[PDB]
Design a protein around this ligand. Structure first.
Ligand SMILES: *[C@@H]1O[C@H](CO)[C@@H](O[C@@H]2O[C@H](CO)[C@@H](O)[C@H](O)[C@H]2NC(C)=O)[C@H](O)[C@H]1NC(C)=O
Ligand SMILES: *[C@@H]1O[C@H](CO)[C@@H](O[C@@H]2O[C@H](CO)[C@@H](O)[C@H](O)[C@H]2NC(C)=O)[C@H](O)[C@H]1NC(C)=O
Ligand SMILES: *[C@@H]1O[C@H](CO)[C@@H](O[C@@H]2O[C@H](CO)[C@@H](O)[C@H](O)[C@H]2NC(C)=O)[C@H](O)[C@H]1NC(C)=O
Ligand SMILES: O=c1ccc2ccccc2o1
Ligand SMILES: [Fe+3]
Ligand SMILES: [Zn+2]
Ligand SMILES: [Zn+2]
Length: 341
């Protein structure tokens, strides 16, 4: 009843969800699926209530009637006077990242290079970059633009999965969940950091969080920011300290979605759940912290300060903005109004 069923994507989020379920006293329980799409379906069926989603998936989900309930909010130097739950969200910066030692690689010389994407249909990992590339090349053959890629969720036999690695055993190659080594903001940057690919489409935060000692994960230990460069749209290259003037787009924050008829309930539970396991929650550090997963961004991004109320009770289009919705719409016409399932 006042119990919420969260949808976890893959084995690792399932384990974090079970831990959460346990500390919550069954106030939250877990459903598990192998992909975000599957989790969206469980929610439509009513077999699950909510899950946190990147903007690209919010678009899929909105067409099927799901609604944004609360958004992820990270720290700001602005609006700091206002409490986290009521502070407007800022949006994140979608950037293209390369290794400095790879001299001469710019936005205009990306053809036939190797790329790393968070996952097919995601904001920074796919929608924005591929949207710009289709626009620029006057072509829908984005499957022929890079020689090889790791783009979780595409055909495993195809070149968009050639660079993906699967799990500890080589199983699950290219699955759009964390079992795939190079999945998500972290996997895509690792794909670049190990030199598997030449470019990685992630957000600004990912570079700062995985360099200069911020990570301790074996592959990130020795990563220095000065060994990285962002590709700007003007053909230029800049240090990662200049993302405000060298980004592909500003993107809406990841947000929690639910079916419209369960929204008020999910919202109420979440606010109480974060009072308990959020940033300064009563039980967070001591027992369990919703927003940590040792750099793996499980269920929520690890840099989340809190989940924030929306205000303006936005529909999913109002939430994503007309800009981003037209970019996705135009990109989708390369692969007609209905719920994808
Ligand atoms: C599960 O949710 C219920 C409901 O919010 C919590 O029980 C409430 O407990 C508070 C304070 O402990 C009481 O003041 C309220 O009257 C109760 N609310 C309801 C609707 O019963 C309970 O503490 C939560 N359990 C956990 C572990 O999160
Ligand atoms: C790709 O090109 C399309 C078409 O020009 C861009 O989509 C349009 O978006 C702009 C706003 O940015 C509107 O002024 C146009 O009228 C829109 N057109 C259509 C047909 O929808 C799209 O934004 C570009 N994609 C990216 C990622 O920049
Ligand atoms: C790019 O993202 C980083 C976060 O990954 C932003 O820097 C953080 O800024 C806050 C203050 O608002 C600090 O408390 C953190 O310590 C910073 N993080 C790190 C790891 O350095 C940065 O300002 C963002 N820039 C743009 C242009 O959006
Ligand atoms: O997608 C968005 C997100 C926030 C916002 C605020 C004011 C006006 C339009 C907006 O669109
Ligand atoms: Fe995202
Ligand atoms: Zn901009
Ligand atoms: Zn509105």
């Amino acid at each position: 009843y006042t119990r919420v069923v969260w949808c976890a994507v893959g084995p690792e989020e399932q384990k974090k969800c079970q831990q959460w379920s346990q500390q919550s006293g069954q106030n939250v329980t877990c459903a598990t699926a192998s992909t975000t799409d599957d989790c969206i379906v469980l929610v439509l069926k009513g077999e699950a209530d909510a899950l946190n989603l990147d903007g690209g998936y919010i678009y899929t989900a909105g067409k099927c009637g799901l609604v944004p309930v609360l958004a992820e909010n990270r720290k700001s130097s602005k609006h700091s006077s206002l409490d986290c739950v009521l502070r407007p969200t800022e949006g994140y910066l979608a950037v293209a990242v390369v290794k400095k030692a790879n001299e001469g690689l710019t936005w205009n010389s990306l053809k036939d290079k190797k790329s790393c994407h968070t996952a097919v249909d995601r904001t920074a990992g796919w929608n924005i970059p591929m949207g710009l590339i289709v626009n620029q090349t006057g072509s829908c053959a984005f499957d022929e633009f890079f020689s090889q890629s790791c783009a979780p969720g595409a055909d495993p036999k195809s070149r968009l999965c050639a660079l993906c690695a699967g799990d500890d055993q080589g199983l699950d190659k290219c699955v759009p969940n964390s079992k795939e080594k190079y999945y998500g903001y972290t996997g895509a940057f690792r794909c670049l950091a190990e030199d598997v690919g030449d470019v990685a489409f992630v957000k600004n935060d990912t570079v700062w969080e995985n360099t200069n000692g911020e990570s301790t994960a074996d592959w990130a230990k020795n990563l220095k920011r000065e060994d990285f460069r962002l590709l700007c749209l003007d053909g230029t290259r800049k240090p990662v300290t200049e993302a405000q003037s060298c980004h592909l787009a500003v993107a809406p924050n990841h947000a929690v979605v639910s079916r419209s008829d369960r929204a008020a309930h999910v919202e109420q539970v979440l606010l109480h759940q974060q009072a308990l396991f959020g940033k300064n929650g009563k039980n967070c550090p001591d027992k369990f912290c919703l927003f940590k997963s040792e750099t793996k961004n499980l269920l929520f991004n690890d840099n989340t300060e809190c989940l924030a109320k929306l205000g303006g009770r936005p529909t999913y289009e109002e939430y994503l903005g007309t800009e981003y919705v037209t970019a996705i719409a135009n990109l989708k016409k390369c692969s007609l109004e209905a719920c994808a399932f």
